[PDB]
Scaffold this active site. Structure first.
Site, PDB file in Angstrom:
ATOM      1  N   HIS A   1      28.806  64.740  57.661  1.00 44.48           N
ATOM      2  CA  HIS A   1      27.456  64.906  58.258  1.00 44.48           C
ATOM      3  C   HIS A   1      26.419  64.507  57.254  1.00 44.48           C
ATOM      4  CE1 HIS A   1      30.001  67.620  60.563  1.00 44.48           C
ATOM      5  NE2 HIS A   1      29.091  67.557  61.528  1.00 44.48           N
TER       6      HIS A   1
ATOM      7  N   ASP B   1      27.442  62.136  60.852  1.00 41.63           N
ATOM      8  CA  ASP B   1      26.818  62.673  62.057  1.00 41.63           C
ATOM      9  C   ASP B   1      25.490  63.360  61.748  1.00 41.63           C
ATOM     10  OD1 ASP B   1      28.920  61.704  63.492  1.00 41.63           O
ATOM     11  OD2 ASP B   1      29.835  63.651  63.930  1.00 41.63           O
TER      12      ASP B   1
END
Ligand SMILES: [Co+2]
Length: 205
Positions: free
Chosen positions: A151, A8
């Protein structure tokens, strides 16, 4: 045994390239759930690099706001605008959506025509946690079909690329193969069907 490594919160020319370099080193494919605000002429080449390298791009909304309480018009705008910039620079259209903060509602499901994905998290948004801790969280949580939520972009220290130097070899040595989200569904024989209004943390549900 399949897993999907997903990232992400990008693209970021510097931080995303650190993740892409590790994926090149190990010849692994992954999926990037990108934020529309970050996709622009400055990040066009690195978005294209994802495609060029066999990775998939999904939609993580226009911004960083939770969407569960947004109106249908707010939701539609955020998803459509993000798709339009991904199409411009990547030449692809997302099939998958990751809700900001993993927050959903019936309205959100009703107004996003993409398959919703969550996944196994690894505390990799907490800068005090080390590469080894991030890797241990992933390695001990996976099973066949897991979607792994990491992430590529966070405030630093952000040793997620370094965690991949443990995650990728360990899982390969245990018989796992890394696939994109589309590949994960396809290889498991699960239709990629946005009319399913459930969040997938693994495949099959
Ligand atoms: Co996010």
């Amino acid at each position: 045994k399949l897993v999907a490594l997903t990232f992400d919160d990008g693209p970021d020319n510097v931080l995303t390239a650190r993740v892409l370099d590790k994926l090149d080193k190990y010849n692994v494919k992954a999926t990037f759930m990108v934020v529309g605000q970050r996709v622009n002429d400055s990040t066009a080449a690195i978005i294209r690099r994802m495609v060029n390298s066999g990775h998939e791009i999904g939609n993580h909304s226009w911004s960083y706001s939770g969407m569960a309480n947004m109106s249908p018009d707010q939701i539609r705008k955020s998803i459509a605008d993000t798709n339009a910039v991904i199409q411009k620079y990547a030449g692809t259209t997302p099939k998958f959506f990751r809700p900001p903060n993993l927050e959903t509602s019936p309205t959100l499901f009703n107004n996003v025509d993409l398959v919703f994905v969550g996944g196994l998290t690894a505390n990799d948004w907490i800068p005090s946690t080390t590469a080894e801790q991030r890797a241990a969280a992933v390695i001990n949580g996976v099973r066949d079909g897991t979607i792994i939520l990491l992430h590529d972009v966070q405030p630093e220290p952000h040793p997620t690329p370094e965690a991949l130097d443990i995650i990728i070899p360990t899982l390969k040595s245990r018989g796992y193969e890394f696939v994109t989200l589309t590949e994960l569904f396809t290889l498991k024989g699960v239709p990629i069907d946005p009319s399913v209004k459930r969040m997938y943390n693994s495949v099959p549900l």
